[PDB]
Design a protein around this ligand. Sequence first.
Ligand SMILES: *CC(=O)N[C@@H](C)c1cccc2ccccc12
Ligand SMILES: *CC(=O)N[C@@H](C)c1cccc2ccccc12
Lengths: 304, 304
Amino acid sequence: SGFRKMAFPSGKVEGCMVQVTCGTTTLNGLWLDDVVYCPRHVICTSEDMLNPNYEDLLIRKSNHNFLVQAGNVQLRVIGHSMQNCVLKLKVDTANPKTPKYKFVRIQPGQTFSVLACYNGSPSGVYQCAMRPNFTIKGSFLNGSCGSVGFNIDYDCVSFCYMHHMELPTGVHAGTDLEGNFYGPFVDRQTAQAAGTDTTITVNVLAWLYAAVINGDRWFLNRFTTTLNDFNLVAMKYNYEPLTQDHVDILGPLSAQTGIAVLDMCASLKELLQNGMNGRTILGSALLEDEFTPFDVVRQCSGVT
Amino acid sequence: SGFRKMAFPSGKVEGCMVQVTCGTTTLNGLWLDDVVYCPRHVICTSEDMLNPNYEDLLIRKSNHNFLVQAGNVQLRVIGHSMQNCVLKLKVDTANPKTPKYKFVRIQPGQTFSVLACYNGSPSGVYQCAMRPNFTIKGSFLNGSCGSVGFNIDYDCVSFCYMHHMELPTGVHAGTDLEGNFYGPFVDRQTAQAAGTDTTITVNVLAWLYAAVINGDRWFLNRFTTTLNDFNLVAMKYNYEPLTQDHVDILGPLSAQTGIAVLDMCASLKELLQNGMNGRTILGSALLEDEFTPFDVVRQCSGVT
Ligand SMILES: *CC(=O)N[C@@H](C)c1cccc2ccccc12
Ligand SMILES: *CC(=O)N[C@@H](C)c1cccc2ccccc12
């Protein structure tokens, strides 16, 4: 029993982290096979960052200007290319610790683990969600760029995020591993405001199911609702609309607990309208939205 | 910027996890050098667990009754002993992935990372604290016994916890790696109630400092207090007494923020008396007590 904000074991990703230095900028790279992936802004001076022309800046860079260090051993860079907002540094050595992997572009509301790194060395691991406004709420100091977000399916690491930017509001923006930003963000030090950070409704519902499975049941009420009625209340509270697709995804948790999804919606509706009245659910005083239905099943079943 | 409940990177510990089977019970072992450490209750039938005599039960067990599997390879058990509530299985092979390590017995209020494992395979990593009542609030299904808690200092893993028991209230009890339970708990399926789960005051204060460092400042007020005045309020709210030793430990966060520890106590005092009034601090609606002052410094500075 018990339910924790749980990250994937980070070992398979730790084995992929390297240090990338271009001039006086050091950040993190991801070494898979004979390619090191890193933010293209590794090439920028802080002056460059205000209005960088990455193609023009890259012309001044040779393979030997990219210093790649794996532990205390230097890797030889034999090629470099820009793909969207990432650099791909071809090295002469395949990472011997390369796990089975995929690059995936996640949807808002999807959760993943971040391995926060500085100088190619892992400092910590935590669980994130892609926010509906395509930011993440991370923990990233200077030097943490190139840190990655991932999911694991048994032995296959799906890489979904690479850290690029902190917005003036202290929320985070980055790319998939093809170098495409999540959301409208750019690797330029300019006015970039996030949109509404709405609550991931399907995730809250999943977590309420987790609560029931772990004995926290005080919020279960006598009511039901419809998707349309619930959605009127959701909209008023800056919750994402719930779709039949979300209802379908929650079916297994419905089945396990015997609580109809729309009944749990009606419980969530009363929590929104009434508040927590100083009570907690799984040790939280707010409704947690960084567990997916898949996460809740995984943790309640014990997948490895 | 940003502040997350962050675990240590788990790779060094993943390399130590094995499966231990005695009869029809499978749980986790920790393989360091040529010793596999596991809960002694691996030898019990569920009938045994009601009133186990571990010395008597152990007489019926030989080295060959302990099946130890590291990945899909069997380890040869050449000796076994009981130390308090752990078994030490001597194997003929040193773990080639043994990291630098120590066994440490932590104090209440100290935080650590748990690598939740099933069948010797890692499922997830999360951050815990030793509660003042010597329980932890974990995420542990059947099969998770022998999962470990640890801290890392650069490259030395300090092992502080091994999972043994879930109490009827769904909180967790376990041992250090010398097999001594935290608190008054025993590896017997009997009436074991936890004491008062008080809030770790020095940890809340550390986290309020983290909040100020990351721009969450709304709770800072015009007041100060004394340790004695604060402690009157703490006692009323089931917070641990704050000692001068705690004040000394918070000095570096005091220095960095320029907020006197007793001023931050007076802010915490007003939050206890007034509540959050529906506001959040670092995305929490309750005062977080599972960050130590050391954790806050580490994460705000970026140690690897
Ligand atoms: C996130 C990161 O590690 N890289 C960027 C933000 C960075 C770090 C340190 C100095 C510097 C100077 C000029 C531009 C960018 C950076
Ligand atoms: C925690 C754990 O993995 N071991 C214990 C609780 C256990 C698991 C599964 C079956 C069983 C049967 C009898 C006693 C103990 C167990």
